[PDB]
DNA sequence: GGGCAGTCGCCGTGTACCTCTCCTAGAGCAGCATGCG
RNA sequence: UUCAAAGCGGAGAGGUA
DNA sequence: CGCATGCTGCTCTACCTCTCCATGACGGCGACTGCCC
């Protein structure tokens, strides 16, 4: 609800919603990072702050689509902020009707099940639900990232197998 | 240049399922259908001709051998026998061929009916309870309400309601032409075939354009599902099964216990139940039995196929010999002990061993001690190659006999085989990347692995019962990469924070503290002047000064004392402009408005030892 | 131990695809780093951060 | 030490089963009648005519059979109308018998039935608090066997009832359906307006509609019936065959609710329900005499042992038998029948066999030494069929309750997933006939302890209103309590009172701990975690070649050894006339002869020796109760698990680092810490459809250089030394293919050697029973002697573990001011951070005892007599030893426990004196000969084609996913890919890699592993259309589906990698 | 006899707090202001 | 219709290694030991 | 010319780090 | 002197239904359900 408060304030004050989304996400990100680091430092444990920043940006990088103007985006879909922004810009450059959106906070388990590869998600949790949804949508997996080249037996795209 | 680029998934049509099985033969008929529930012959350990282990369908049991034994030899390639029609080829093809079972009555797939989202209910605009009642023969459904007033499309009737409607339709008095059809079976195929996705999508969009309230999310879900089916070019009625496939027989094998008893799988029981019920229902349909028994058979067949696909999801679990559930097809893939997490994301490997660890001092970091009984086993192919090339033996069999006989030359070869070959060591709960490291092995005598004391905190190891696992790399790339990226002598800092990770920890810090401390008693030889540090060390080594005495040494360099007085003291302006400033721990003597002439430091022989050791290590 | 292991597995699966592919995105945004202090006392100095 | 028989739970339970446990179940089922009521079967279950066992205990052990008896019950068949009575005796089953030590012998293995701690039957009240609502109270009524009942109070003041797991319903329906008018339920209740509110809100019910509604709610979908509801209630609560409170359930109900119902009636009645409702109302209204219950209290928990569990199994089998009898009796119209031909004992035999062989309450015995054996029979478990489950047990069940005091040990538990779920009975505790644990106390009158008045046993609930003092309080003449303030316990709290106001005193200071923890001297100077470690590790020691008593024992050693039944004491008070390694004879004063036979080099469940040796000589005067022979883990009378060795506390040159141990070479050539281990091998000759199997020495493809030690019958000879890969028994099977036999004779597994000591063999046509289809059985026993070596685990009694890392020649060890080299050097870094201060006390007292030849005994908690008793005693003993010996270097006043030590390599003394003493150390069962394994290539799994797992079958090491993550973090790509494919399941790349390595070429690129193809087939079999595709190069071409299951290279692909030649 | 009421003056956090923070769950505290303003009347009513 | 409290059911809960035990019911059919006149 | 006869799945109980 | 009957080993196949096998775990999230406007 802190995210909603910030988004509403910045939408009432600022004009464009892109900057409101960015500022709201920035403030929530800072709060989360500081809270986790404080909890760890209460004991005698020290970790660098990049390690927590990498994890936290995986939770605050999506948006919920509302009233898509003319793109192929029904309400209720979760999409990356950058993709939505680029599509809206390229569509409204000619003068079309843009789409609305609202930032969301996901979590560490709900975000791992929203990946674009069904092989990674089926091997984590809830295999039958993921496989049924993928079968209905007719999804295809292009084998990018770890945990999918390991299953087939290929060189991982990191390290000495980068190129 | 790779074989494939991506993986795609979709719904299976009956044509595809029949095409997976149903291979052809150089005759006028196809073979790939399972028709009888027999698995194996009791008298002789052979499979039957039409069953879960048949040889006409799944391939021969013994390579280049036919069922009747008439054919043999690898000369016979791609030619089928005549007395029994079994193709002659390798037996490995047995874990490829599939086959299929043809159902006498359609059944519904339980994944698409009983799910957290149910897709049949969403597509048909009906609640899950109504669809579940129409299936399993609990109610009826109206397919055509034509020429009536109180009947609507997709309305659930009942036995008494159907009887009372029959009392009017069968009178045929008037106003009831165009007999309405009701059907107490599934009839889901007819309801799903009646779908007209394009105009349904158009109507749904037209309705969703106007008015929202707060509960248009249902229409949004329906539109999403309809659009998925339109885009994929699938048919919804494929969610109701008409044929099913059968897994190849080596993935459900028969194993023999010690006492001669058989331990068959759980899939064979489920397949047997399905086949038996299907055959019984077909037989009943042939004789034109009363319908009230045919419906019971159909319901039982539905429950059997459902229990094969997924056990205990909708109804009651099927128990086997004991009161324990049987393992279905979904249990193979879904769990923590399923295929994904047990066989694909982690496996068992060759050229590996395990043993207890003890402490080895006098080892250098990047070295480990490997027992002589494990090395001769993990390094066998390299030993054989070296025996063949140098010390010309002959063939591989002679080399293996030489190893078995325990010739003295074996250890001489092994010692030069293993030098320059790194080895990877691992401990059980690998919590970070420093739980696996590479070392260079040294052959030791005994049955325990020797570990350097300076790597214990990284492994979190301890010498009270811990055990370690050993793996070896085979190819040139693995060896170069283990030497250049994982060797234990290049792991100084930690990746979580840049603090050092290889420091003297327990008994070395105590020794350094004792050596470099101070002692008010036991101060023989205090106040003696030495030239350079080596003289002081030589005077201490042959007992003439204590380890804790206070001595003056001549040292031109940089000093760092504790409890120091940064302000100069006892400045004595001597003759000729020479000034000798005397501090608490130094005796610098400086020239007149110039540079430094000499310096002396008051210290302890143990401190001289410590600092000389560090400087010698750095300069050499 | 079970709670710690489950948490680590979830963390690994959420963030497995973060690999370094680019040299520079060319931006001008960042955050403000300051010392971590409990009012009068400081807990983590700015130089360590 | 007032200690009675330590293993008495098992004996009492089995005696109860034999006396009145089988009778009660046999007589509760006897009158079996058919539906016409013409024939009756009566089981006069009072005689049982038990037949004597056909085999002794030793014969059963050595034959690998079962020790049991046969049960025969007399029955009579009565025909109505026409008078016809037939009498006979029917065979019921085989009952395994309990040996003299409290254990069972099933299929030649020793087994023990574990005791189970469960919740007692009765009525339990609880108060639950809503998020925003008031406090609401519920009550649960739980029987021994049957349906459960639940009452609940709502937020508006309404009373609801739940039966089993049906829907909730107002209490008025249940009370009217039971047959109670308004006036009596108004009078019995104490506050009738509270129930009057429910009456008004829910409407008055008459009997007819009460049963109507009860039937409607219990069994929906059926037409209601009055008789239906009546029968449903009668079957639910009032049927002896379907409902049972038990004796304990009736006792608890009467005790809590204050009723007066008879003890013989064991089913629910109306007064119990009325009283439960009244108690709930009073608890809601805060009457004053009502209180909620605690479920972890030891007054609400019970113990079940072998008698009750066997009774339940017998009951189930008897129900099945009655079903069979009723089905079979009516199939014949004409009688032509006898009671023998009517009963079938198969279901009862099957039930008993399943209970004793395949249950999870019957467990394989722990038999490493007598202490482990003794403590395995006194164990209490909270898991099993009728208790808890591992995923459901939480923080509250694994804790220590204040009611465990003197009944369950607070120290001895496992570490890991089983911590707090298995416990051990305390030293003085005993279980009464209801199933509750008791403990003894002495009475205190006017501050005087009456140590001559028969201590009283009291349960947890009884001793809550009394003020009970601990067992360490000091009295002056076994009389008045000294001091002015005394610690007491009142209502589970610790307070202090004047010693004219205490009521009871505990018997002994060790009443709170178990038997394993009672053997640790100077325990009050140790931490609790290390005490747990030491008590657990004392039960993993190995019996040694020549045992030896401790010098600083605690006083309980002679009692912990008398229960294993391996020490022989003379009952005679006479003379000894014949002594031998296998026989002893003692003659009384004209009182005949007593002869004993001794077991020699037998084998335990864990492959350890079970020898027995005599102590006495011929013509010796012997008194009654004197030890005559002793076992393999006892010195004269008492337990002896370790040895006394010289120890010094100091660091060596890095060999003591982090729990490692440095020892001397004297412990190897003096045969200290050497043990005997015996193994058993078995081969079976069966018959096949192709033909039978023959045991003979005519083995094909073998030379006479490998048949030296066979006895021209195909079986090895006694006294032969067998190394690895040696034939023991030669067998040939009739293969089908000239010579048609194949060789699969059994050989010793890799890594085993020793002497052959026994070749006992059994066959048909000789009176031996064999499994079906088999002709003969051959068993071979092989023994070996193992010495201490680098990699073995050593331990002490105070929790100090270690692994041996070096064995120094005796001229390198540090030595004393008399020239004696030390035996072991221990690191002092491990003492202060773990707080084992008692080991130093033990070392110093052992030093004094060795110098005096004294063998002291110290009991735990010894500071009630002085301020610092242990230090003063140790200092006085050391000073006395110094004065008696005459050597001044023994004891110094400046550094009491420290003396000077020299360097054996250079001869120079160390800078400061160190602590030396005599320590009692033990050798554990974790030896490095059983932990080393290696593999290059071997068998593979059938489905996945991955290497097998297991030391006994040439298995591989698992590379889990955490190691995969670690290799991914390093940037490794080629090591990982080589591990995943070429070394695991790339069926064609394995042979190519091996041949390339042998030939010296480069290893070729891998392919797709087999597990991925297996997964694709499994997913296709679920009606999923999954495939792999290759993208199209040009624009409008279609993507092409790639066929994985088709090798393109027509080259050899064997199942296992093979060497080319 | 009685049940006295009093106010005591009285924190460390561990794994549950970290799991709750990383999974973005809903705790039960911390009423949050929604609009800027500049005055906070406590309004101790009757 | 709108809006619920309240309730029912499914998902999830550390890694590596070692030792021991046991593993489908019922019915049908054929050949050998036992008490009696 | 051929290889070739030693490997098997599940459930329960306990232990070491 | 010989004749009639119970016990044991092997073989061969087929499966559904209950009085339900339990009613001491805890959190999260989605889909029915009765009740009050
Ligand atoms: Mg350890
Ligand atoms: Zn043929």
Residue of B nearest to D931 (CA): B355
Ligand nearest the Cα atom of residue B66: 2
Interface membership of C10 toward A (CB under 8 Å): yes
Is B160 known to sit in a ligand binding site?
no
Q: Which residues pair with B369 in a beta bridge?
A: B442, B450
Contact E/B (≥3 CB pairs under 8 Å): no
- SS3 at position B272: helix
Count of CA atoms in the C-beta half-sphere (13 A) of D21: 19
Measured in angstroms, the CA of B431 and the nearest CA of chain A are apart by: 15
**D418 CA to middle of ligand 1, Å?**
19
Chain A: residues touching E (Cβ < 8 Å)? 1-2, 5, 9, 32, 35-36, 39-40, 42-43, 55, 59, 105-109
Closest CA to B6 of D130, A148, D649, D616: A148
Residue at token pair 């393992």:
B327
CB contact under 8 A, B7 and A143: yes
Residue of A nearest to E30 (CA): A2
Show Cβ contacts of residue D432 under 8 Å, excluding neighbours closer than 6 positions: D438, D457, D459
Closest CA to D864 of D449, D300, D471: D471
The reply to whether B122 Cβ lies less than 7 angstroms from strand H is: no
Residue at token pair 């929530």:
A28
The reply to whether B260 Cβ lies less than 7 angstroms from strand H is: no
User: Nearest nt (C1') to B467 (CA)?
Assistant: G17
Rounded to whole angstroms, the distance from the CA of residue B338 to the C1' of nucleotide H32 is: 33
Report the interhelical angle of D9-16 vs D306-329 (nearest 10°): 30
Closest CA to D830 of B466, B427, B503, B510: B510
The reply to whether D773 Cβ lies less than 7 angstroms from strand H is: yes
CA-based max dimension of chain E? 51
- SS3 at position D729: strand
Is B331 known to sit in a ligand binding site?
no
User: Nearest nt (C1') to B74 (CA)?
Assistant: G2
- SS3 at position D430: strand
First to last CA, chain B: 52
| Cβ(D1015)–Cβ(B344) below 8 Å | yes
Q: How far is CA D884 from CA D846, D853, D878, D890, in A?
A: 16, 11, 10, 11
Rounded distance between C-alpha atoms, residue D629 and residue D257, angstroms: 58
What's D731's DSSP letter? E
Rounded distance between C-alpha atoms, residue A76 and residue A72, angstroms: 12
Closest CA to B234 of B225, B242, B244, B243: B225
User: Nearest nt (C1') to D393 (CA)?
Assistant: H25
Q: How far is CA D186 from CA B472, D156, D207, D1003, in A?
A: 86, 21, 17, 94
Rounded distance between C-alpha atoms, residue B457 and residue B500, angstroms: 12
Rounded to whole angstroms, the distance from the CA of residue D537 to the C1' of nucleotide G16 is: 12
Interface partners of chain D (CB pairs < 8 Å, 3 or more) are A, B
**B75 CA to middle of ligand 2, Å?**
16
Closest CA to D179 of D208, D207, D204, D199: D207
What's D427's DSSP letter? S
Closest CA to D956 of D917, D984, D978: D984
Strands, E, within D463-551: which ranges? 468-469, 486-489, 494-497, 504-506
Rounded distance between C-alpha atoms, residue B556 and residue B568, angstroms: 18
Residue A36 with chain E: CB contacts under 8 Å: 18, 21-22
Which residue numbers in chain A precede an interruption (C–N > 2.5 Å)?
A: none
**B472 CA to middle of ligand 2, Å?**
48
| Cβ(D408)–Cβ(D422) below 8 Å | no
CATH number of D675-786, picked from 3.40.250.10, 2.40.50.150, 2.40.50.100, 2.60.40.10: 2.40.50.150
The reply to whether B65 Cβ lies less than 7 angstroms from strand H is: no
Q: Which residues pair with D644 in a beta bridge?
A: D920
Rounded to whole angstroms, the distance from the CA of residue D916 to the C1' of nucleotide F18 is: 37
Rounded distance between C-alpha atoms, residue B316 and residue D294, angstroms: 37
Extract the tokens encoding B361: 């001092």
Closest CA to B154 of B166, B144, B169: B144
Strands, E, within D486-540: which ranges? 486-489, 494-497, 504-506
Q: List the single protein residue with the shortest CA to C1' distance from H25.
A: D392
Bases in strand F with any atom closer than 7 Å to a protein CB: 2-3, 10-25
Residue at token pair 């020794």:
B511
Cα angle, residue B388 at apex, residues B384 and B394 outer, rounded to 5°: 115
| Cβ(D459)–Cβ(D436) below 8 Å | yes
First to last CA, chain E: 32
Strands, E, within B128-278: which ranges? 140-144, 156-157, 181-182, 240-245, 255-256, 262-263
Measured in angstroms, the CA of A21 and the nearest CA of chain D are apart by: 34
**Which of A9, A35, A107 lies nearest to residue E23, judging by beta carbons?**
A107
Extract the tokens encoding D631: 């076992």
Cα angle, residue B441 at apex, residues B436 and B444 outer, rounded to 5°: 120
Residue of C nearest to E19 (CA): C7
CATH fold of D119-304:
3.90.1110
Strand G neighbours (CB under 7 Å) are B 255-257, 263, 265, 324, 428-429, 462, 464-466; D 360, 363-364, 366, 381, 383, 414-416, 418, 422, 536-537, 540, 742, 744, 801, 926, 938-939, 941-943, 948, 950, 953-954, 1054-1055, 1058
| Cβ(D896)–Cβ(D805) below 8 Å | no
Interface partners of chain A (CB pairs < 8 Å, 3 or more) are B, C, D, E
Count of CA atoms in the C-beta half-sphere (13 A) of D554: 26
**B50 CA to middle of ligand 2, Å?**
15
Extract the tokens encoding B489: 């002598």
**D426 CA to middle of ligand 1, Å?**
30
Ligand nearest the Cα atom of residue B468: 1
The reply to whether A109 Cβ lies less than 7 angstroms from strand F is: no
Burial D808-823 (b: 16+ CB within 10 A, else e): beeebbbbbeeeebbb
Rounded distance between C-alpha atoms, residue D914 and residue D840, angstroms: 12
Extract the tokens encoding D589: 């004063």
Rounded distance between C-alpha atoms, residue A84 and residue A77, angstroms: 11
Asked whether the CA dihedral D632, D638, D642, D645 is positive or negative, the reply is negative
Interface membership of A50 toward B (CB under 8 Å): no
Strands, E, within B499-583: which ranges? 529-531, 551-554, 572-573, 579-580
Show Cβ contacts of residue B389 under 8 Å, excluding neighbours closer than 6 positions: D1000
CB contact under 8 A, C19 and A38: no
Rounded distance between C-alpha atoms, residue B438 and residue B419, angstroms: 14
Rounded to whole angstroms, the distance from the CA of residue B244 to the C1' of nucleotide F12 is: 32
Closest CA to B294 of B308, B283, B307, B305: B283
The reply to whether B117 Cβ lies less than 7 angstroms from strand F is: no
Determination technique for this entry? cryo-EM
The side-by-side arrangement of strands in the sheet containing A100-103 is: A78-80, A62-66, A100-103
Backbone phi and psi for residue B56, each to the nearest 5 degrees, phi listed first = -70, -35
**B44 CA to middle of ligand 2, Å?**
17
Rounded distance between C-alpha atoms, residue D910 and residue D263, angstroms: 79
Q: How far is CA B601 from CA B526, B573, B583, in A?
A: 14, 21, 10
Nucleic chain H: which protein residues 918-947 of D have CB below 7 A from it? none
CA-based max dimension of chain A? 58
| Cβ(D404)–Cβ(D463) below 8 Å | no
Interface membership of A146 toward B (CB under 8 Å): no
- Which of A153, A161, A163 best probes binding to D when mutated, by most D CB atoms within 10 angstroms? A153
Closest CA to D101 of D367, D382, D311, D312: D367
Counting every residue written for chain E, the total comes to 46
First to last CA, chain C: 30
Strands, E, within D625-726: which ranges? 627-631, 643-649, 660-664, 675-686, 694-695, 721-722
Rounded to whole angstroms, the distance from the CA of residue B464 to the C1' of nucleotide G17 is: 9
| Cβ(D775)–Cβ(D630) below 8 Å | no
Interface membership of A119 toward B (CB under 8 Å): yes
Q: Helix (H) and strand (E) counts for chain E?
A: 1, 0
**Which of A131, A150, A161 lies nearest to residue D964, judging by beta carbons?**
A150
CB contact under 8 A, C11 and E22: yes
CB contact under 8 A, A145 and C16: yes
User: Nearest nt (C1') to D961 (CA)?
Assistant: F15
The number of beta carbons lying within 10 Å of the beta carbon of residue B328 is 22
**D525 CA to middle of ligand 1, Å?**
24
**B462 CA to middle of ligand 1, Å?**
5
């Amino acid at each position: 609800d802190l995210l909603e408060i910030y988004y509403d304030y910045f939408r009432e004050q600022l004009g464009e919603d892109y900057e409101a989304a960015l500022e709201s996400l920035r403030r929530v990100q800072a709060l989360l990072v500081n809270e986790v680091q404080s909890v760890y430092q209460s004991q005698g444990i020290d970790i660098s702050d990049k390690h927590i920043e990498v994890i936290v940006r995986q939770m605050t990088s999506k948006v919920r689509i509302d009233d898509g103007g003319d793109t192929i985006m029904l309400p209720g879909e979760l999409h990356e902020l950058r993709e939505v922004y680029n599509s809206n810009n390229t569509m409204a450059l000619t003068g079309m009707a843009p789409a609305q959106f609202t930032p969301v906070l996901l979590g560490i388990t709900k975000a791992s099940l929203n990946t674009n590869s069904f092989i990674s998600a089926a091997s984590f949790q809830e295999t039958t639900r993921v496989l049924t949804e993928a079968a209905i949508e007719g999804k295809s997996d292009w084998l990018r990232g770890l945990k999918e080249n390991v299953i087939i037996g290929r060189l991982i795209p990191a390290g000495t197998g980068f190129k | 240049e790779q074989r494939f680029d991506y993986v795609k998934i979709a719904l299976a049509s009956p044509e595809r399922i029949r095409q997976w099985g149903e291979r052809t033969l150089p005759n006028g008929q196809v073979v790939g259908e399972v028709t009888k529930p027999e698995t194996i012959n009791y008298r002789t350990l052979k499979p039957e001709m039409d069953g879960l282990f048949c040889e006409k369908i799944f391939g021969p049991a013994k390579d280049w051998e036919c069922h009747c034994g008439k054919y043999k030899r690898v000369r016979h390639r791609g030619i089928v026998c005549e007395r029994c029609g079994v193709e002659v080829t390798e037996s490995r093809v047995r874990r490829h061929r599939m086959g299929f079972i043809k159902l006498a009555a359609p059944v519904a797939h339980v994944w698409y009916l009983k799910g957290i989202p149910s897709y049949i209910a969403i597509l048909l605009d009906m609640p899950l309870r109504d669809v579940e009642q129409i299936v399993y023969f609990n109610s009826y459904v109206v397919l055509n309400p034509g020429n009536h007033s109180e009947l609507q499309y997709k309305q659930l009737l009942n036995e008494d309601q159907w009887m009372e409607i029959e009392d009017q339709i069968y009178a045929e008095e008037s106003d009831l032409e165009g007999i309405e059809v009701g059907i107490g079976a599934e009839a889901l195929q007819q309801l799903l075939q009646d779908l007209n996705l394009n105009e349904e999508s158009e109507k749904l969009r037209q309705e969703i354009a106007e008015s929202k309230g707060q509960k248009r999310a249902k229409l949004i879900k329906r539109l999403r599902v309809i659009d998925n089916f339109i885009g994929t070019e699938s048919r919804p009625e494929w969610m109701v099964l008409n044929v099913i496939p059968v897994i190849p027989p080596d993935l459900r094998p028969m194993v023999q216990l010690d006492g001669g008893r058989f331990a068959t799988s759980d899939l064979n029981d489920l397949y047997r139940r399905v086949i038996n019920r299907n055959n019984r229902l077909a037989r009943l349909q042939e004789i034109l039995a009363p319908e009230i028994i045919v419906r019971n058979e159909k319901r039982m067949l539905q429950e059997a196929v459902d229990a094969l696909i997924d056990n205990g999801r909708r109804g009651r679990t099927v128990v086997g010999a004991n009161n324990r559930p049987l393992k279905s097809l979904s249990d193979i893939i879904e769990g923590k002990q399923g295929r994904f997490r047990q066989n694909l994301l982690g496996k068992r490997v060759d050229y590996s061993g395990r043993s207890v660890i003890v402490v080895g001092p006098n080892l250098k970091i990047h070295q480990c001690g490997l027992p002589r009984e494990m090395a001769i086993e993990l390094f066998q192919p390299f030993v054989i190659h070296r025996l063949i090339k140098n010390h010309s033996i002959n063939n591989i069999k002679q080399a293996k006999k030489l190893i078995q006989k325990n010739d003295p030359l074996i250890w001489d070869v092994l010692e030069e085989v293993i030098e320059g070959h790194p080895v990877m060591l691992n401990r059980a709960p690998t919590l970070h990347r420093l739980g696996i490291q590479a070392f260079e092995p040294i052959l030791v005598e005994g049955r325990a692995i020797q570990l350097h004391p300076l790597v214990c905190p990284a492994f979190n190891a301890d010498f009270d019962g811990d055990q370690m696992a050993v793996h070896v790399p085979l190819s040139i790339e693995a060896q170069a990469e283990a030497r250049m990226l994982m060797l234990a002598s290049g792991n100084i800092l930690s990746p979580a924070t840049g603090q050092p990770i290889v420091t003297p920890s327990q008994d070395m810090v105590l020794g350094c503290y004792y050596l470099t401390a101070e002692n008010p008693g036991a101060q023989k030889g205090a106040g003696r002047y030495f030239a350079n540090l080596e003289d002081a060390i030589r005077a201490f080594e042959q007992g003439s000064v204590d380890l804790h005495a206070w001595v003056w040494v001549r040292f031109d360099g940089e000093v760092e004392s504790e409890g120091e007085s940064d302000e100069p003291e006892s400045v004595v302006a001597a003759d000729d402009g020479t000034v000798t400033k005397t501090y608490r721990f130094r005796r610098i003597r400086e020239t007149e408005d110039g540079q430094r002439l000499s310096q002396y430091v008051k210290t302890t022989p143990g401190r001289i030892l410590f600092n000389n050791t560090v400087q010698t290590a750095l300069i050499h | 131990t079970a709670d710690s292991g489950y948490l680590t597995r979830r963390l690994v699966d959420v963030s497995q695809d973060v690999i370094i592919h680019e040299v520079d995105c060319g931006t001008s945004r960042g955050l403000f780093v300051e010392a971590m202090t409990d009012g009068d006392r400081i807990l983590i100095p700015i130089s360590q951060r | 030490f007032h200690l009675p028989d330590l293993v008495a739970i098992q004996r009492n339970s089995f005696r109860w089963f034999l006396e009145e446990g089988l009778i009660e179940e046999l007589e509760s089922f006897s009158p079996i009648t058919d539906y016409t009521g013409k024939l009756e079967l009566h089981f006069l279950g009072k005689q049982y005519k038990l037949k004597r066992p056909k085999y002794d205990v030793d014969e059963a052990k050595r034959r690998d059979g079962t020790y049991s008896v046969q049960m025969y019950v007399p029955t009579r068949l009565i025909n109505k109308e026409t008078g016809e009575i037939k009498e006979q005796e029917v065979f019921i089953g085989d009952l395994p018998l309990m040996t003299d030590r409290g254990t069972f012998i099933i299929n030649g293995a020793e087994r023990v039935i574990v005791n189970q701690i469960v919740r007692s039957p009765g009525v339990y009240y609880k108060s639950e608090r809503d998020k925003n609502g008031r406090l609401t109270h519920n009550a649960s009524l739980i029987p021994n066997r049957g349906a459960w009942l639940k009452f609940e109070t709502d937020k508006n003041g309404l009373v609801w009832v739940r039966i089993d797991k049906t829907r909730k319903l107002s209490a008025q329906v249940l009370l009217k359906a039971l047959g109670l008018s308004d006036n009596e339920i108004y009078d019995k209740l104490r506050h009738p307006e509270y129930y009057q509110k429910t009456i008004d809100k829910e409407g008055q019910f008459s009997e007819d509609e009460a049963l109507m509604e009860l039937y409607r709610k219990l069994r929906p979908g059926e037409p209601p019936t009055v008789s239906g509801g009546q029968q449903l209630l009668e079957s639910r609560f009032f049927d002896p065959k379907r409902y049972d409170l038990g004796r304990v359930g009736r006792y608890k109900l009467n005790k809590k609710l204050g009723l007066n119902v008879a003890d013989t009636v064991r089913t629910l009645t109306s007064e119990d329900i009325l009283a439960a409702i009244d108690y709930l109302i009073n608890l809601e209204l805060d009457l004053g005499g009502c209180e909620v219950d605690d479920i972890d209290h030891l007054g609400n928990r019970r113990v079940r042992s072998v008698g009750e569990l066997l009774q339940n199994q017998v009951r189930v089998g008897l129900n099945r038998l009655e079903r069979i009898i009723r089905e079979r009796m009516t199939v014949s119209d004409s009688d032509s029948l006898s009671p023998a031909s009517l009963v079938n004992p198969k279901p009862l035999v099957a039930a008993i066999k399943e209970f004793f062989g395949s249950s999870q309450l019957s467990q394989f015995m722990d038999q490493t030494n007598p202490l482990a054996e003794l403590t395995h029979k006194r164990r209490l478990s909270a898991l099993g069929p009728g208790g808890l489950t591992r995923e459901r047990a939480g923080f509250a069940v694994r804790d220590i309750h204040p009611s465990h005091y003197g009944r369950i040990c607070p120290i001895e538990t496992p570490e890991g997933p089983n911590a707090g779920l298995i416990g051990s009975l305390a030293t003085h505790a005993r279980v009464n006939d209801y199933g509750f644990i008791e403990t003894p106390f002495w009475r205190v009158e006017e501050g005087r302890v009456r140590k001559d008045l028969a201590p009283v046993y009291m349960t947890a609930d009884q001793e809550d209103d009394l003020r009970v003092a601990p067992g360490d309080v000091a009295t002056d003449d076994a009389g008045y309590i000294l001091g002015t303030t005394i610690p007491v316990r009142y209502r589970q709290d610790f307070t202090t009172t004047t010693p004219e106001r205490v009521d009871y005193v505990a018997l002994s200071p060790v009443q709170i701990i178990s038997v394993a923890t009672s053997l640790i001297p100077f325990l009050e100077h140790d931490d609790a975690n290390r005490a747990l470690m030491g008590s657990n590790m004392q039960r993993q020691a190995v019996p040694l070649l020549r045992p030896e008593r401790p010098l600083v024992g605690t006083g309980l050693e002679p009692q912990a050894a008398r229960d294993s039944g391996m020490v022989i004491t003379s009952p005679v008070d006479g003379t000894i006339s014949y002594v031998d390694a296998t026989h002893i004879e003692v003659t009384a004063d004209t009182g005949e002869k007593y002869g004993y036979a001794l077991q020699k080099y037998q084998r335990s469940n864990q492959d350890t020796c079970l020898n027995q040796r005599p102590i006495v000589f011929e013509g010796d005067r012997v008194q009654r109760g004197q030890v005559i022979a002793d076992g393999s883990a006892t010195e004269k009378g008492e337990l002896a698990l370790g040895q006394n060795i010289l120890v010094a506390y100091m660091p060596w040159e890095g060999y003591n680092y982090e729990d490692a141990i440095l020892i001397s070479e004297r412990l190897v050539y003096d045969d200290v810490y050497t043990s005997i281990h015996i193994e058993k091998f078995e081969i079976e000759a069966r018959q096949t459809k192709l033909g039978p199997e023959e045991i003979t020495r005519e083995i094909p493809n073998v030379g006479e250089d490998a048949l030296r030690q066979l006895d021209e019958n195909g079986i090895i000879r006694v006294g032969a030394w067998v190394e690895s890969g040696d034939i023991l028994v030669g067998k040939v099977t009739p293969k089908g293919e000239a010579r048609d036999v194949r060789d699969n004779s059994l050989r010793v597994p890799n890594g085993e050697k020793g002497r052959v000591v026994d070749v006992r063999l059994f066959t048909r046509e000789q009176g031996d029973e064999l499994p079906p289809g088999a002709n003969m059985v051959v068993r071979v026993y092989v023994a070996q002697k193992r010495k201490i070596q680098v990699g073995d685990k050593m331990a002490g009694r105070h929790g100090n573990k270690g692994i041996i890392s070096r064995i120094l020649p005796c001229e390198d060890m540090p030595y004393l001011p008399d020239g004696t080299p030390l035996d072991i050097v221990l690191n002092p870094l491990g003492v202060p951070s773990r707080m084992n201060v008692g080991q130093v006390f033990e070392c110093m007292l052992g030093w004094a005892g060795q110098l005096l030849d004294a063998r002291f005994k110290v009991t735990p908690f010894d500071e009630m007599y002085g301020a610092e008793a242990s230090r003063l005693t140790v200092n006085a003993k050391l000073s006395e030893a110094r004065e008696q010996t005459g050597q001044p270097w023994v004891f110094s006043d400046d550094e009491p426990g420290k003396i000077q030590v020299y360097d054996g390599r250079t001869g120079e003394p160390f800078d400061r004196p160190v602590t030396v003493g005599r320590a009692y150390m033990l050798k554990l069962v974790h030896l490095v000969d059983d932990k080393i394994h290696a593999r290059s290539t071997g068998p593979y799994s059938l489905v996945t084609q991955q290497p097998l797992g297991g030391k006994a079958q040439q298995g591989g090491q698992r590379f889990g996913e955490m190691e995969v993550w670690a290799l991914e973090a390093y940037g490794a790509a080629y090591i990982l890919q080589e591990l995943l494919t070429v070394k695991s399941d790339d069926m064609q790349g394995r042979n190519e890699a091996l041949n390339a390595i042998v030939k010296g070429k480069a290893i070729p690129r891998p392919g797709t592993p087999e597990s991925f193809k297996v997964l694709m087939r499994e997913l296709q079999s679920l009606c999923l259309d999954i495939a792999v595709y290759k993208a199209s190069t040009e624009d409008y071409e279609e993507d092409k589906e790639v066929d994985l299951m088709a090798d393109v290279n027509q080259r050899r692909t064997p199942s296992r990698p093979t060497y080319e030649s | 006899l009685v049940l006295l009421v009093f106010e005591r003056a009285k924190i460390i956090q561990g794994l549950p707090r970290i799991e709750e923070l990383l999974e973005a769950r809903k705790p039960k505290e911390a009423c949050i202001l929604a609009r800027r303003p500049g005055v906070a009347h406590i309004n101790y009513s009757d």
